[model samples]
Target: HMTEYKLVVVGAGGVGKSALTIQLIQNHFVDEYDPTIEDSYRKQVVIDGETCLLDILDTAGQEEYSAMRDQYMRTGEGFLCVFAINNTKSFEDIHHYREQIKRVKDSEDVPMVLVGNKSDLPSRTVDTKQAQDLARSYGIPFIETSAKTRQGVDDAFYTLVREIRKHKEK
Candidate 1:
């Protein structure tokens, strides 16, 4: 009678982890902007057409939180490894995310989605092709999204859910 899917939203700082969470839950951006590095624990998100419950955990993006990453990963059925599209450093750190995923999930077959945020900024881009290519190499779904414009944001979340559902029964 109880079914839930744990999802960890993780990445380096300022990659819009909180923004994504706020956008998805509140359906709009938080007006007051307080930017700081800290861990936030939130409740589950109920997708409209899915029966699974999404329990999302938002971790501190700071590199010092590396040790705590495993805790989040252990409880998650899947992950949304996020990064800023304009920030090449975050993109390059995708490998670290993958490494963390493997370490925390303890299974190479776990499902995940690589999300590139901030596509609304024209001045910043690390190349969508490059991001997609890396995602392909890692064998996970890749999506470029923007919370501001709401571009590909919904699809990104739904795609992960759908993919996990496909693997759920099998």
Candidate 2:
């Protein structure tokens, strides 16, 4: 049996949300930064020996498209909240996303992962422990990923699918 995991990727502008999505789906790192309006992808793979189809929604982090976020959140089975390690503002803005997802879902235990992107950058403003603490507060998993280097890219998405799987069993 195969399950379709509806995953929503959320983050602030220029936080490399699209880079992460493109990297996972195409296996090619995106060099240029292009603002997103709305994009979705589907990938069929096996996770933990179980066949799964990942239906991913790569959202526009630009503030201009926020009106569409609620609709996206409503349909998501899991969320990947991404932030750039080199940008502190993006890290600080992650809380708003966390809150909004829970608010829209009307559930406190929404399956989610807190992602710190751009791990390959030499300059990092958001400390690892700081991100861990916030993830702890939310009771979700935290990972550092670099879309350019492809580090933790697959794990970030796979973990979200696992989270959704674990949640659905309940």
Candidate 3:
């Protein structure tokens, strides 16, 4: 039997949320930065020997589209809150994303992952320890990924899926 899950990708503008989603579904990296309004993708994946379909919603992080975030949060079963490792401001803004999800879901125990993107770049402003500490504080998984190199991209999505499954089981 196969299960279906809805995952929302969110973060500050230019945090590579769309990059990770595109890389996961298309197996290709996008070089140019194109702002997203609201893109949806469907992909089938195998996790822990179980087949599942992911309906991923790639959301815009710009303030102009902020009004739609609550709707996305309410519809998603899991969330990937992303930030650029080279951009400290994005890293700092992750809390607002998480809080919005919690507020919309009316639960603090939502399935989510904190992602530090652009790990392939040499210049990093947000260290792993800082991200890990933040994830630990929130009691969620923390992962670092580089969409350009496709490193940890799948794991980031898979981890969120697994968390969603675990939450469902509970």
Using Cα atoms with residue i matched to residue i, what is each candidate's TM-score against the true structure? 0.83, 0.92, 0.92
Better of 1 and 3 by lDDT: 3
Worst 10 residues of 1 by lDDT: 37-46
**lDDT tens string, model 3, 3-94?**
88888998898889888998998889987757855777899988888888898889874546554555666778999999999999999999
**Model 2 clashes, total count:** 0
Candidate 1 runs further than 4 Å off:
31-48, 62-70
Residue 17: error of model 2 in Å? Answer: 0.7
- Per-residue lDDT for 1-170 in model 2, tens only? 78788899988989988899999989898888568557778888888988888888888745555654655678889999999999999999998998888888998899999999999999999999999999999999999999998999999998998898789971
Q: Point out the higher-scoring one by TM-score: 1 or 2.
A: 2
Encode model 1's per-residue lDDT on 1-170: one tens digit a residue.
23576678878777887777777766786544455644444445456544555567767645455555556677677788899999999999878988978986677777789999998888676888998899889888999888777788777777777677766762
The list of candidate 2 runs beyond 4 A from truth reads 62-70
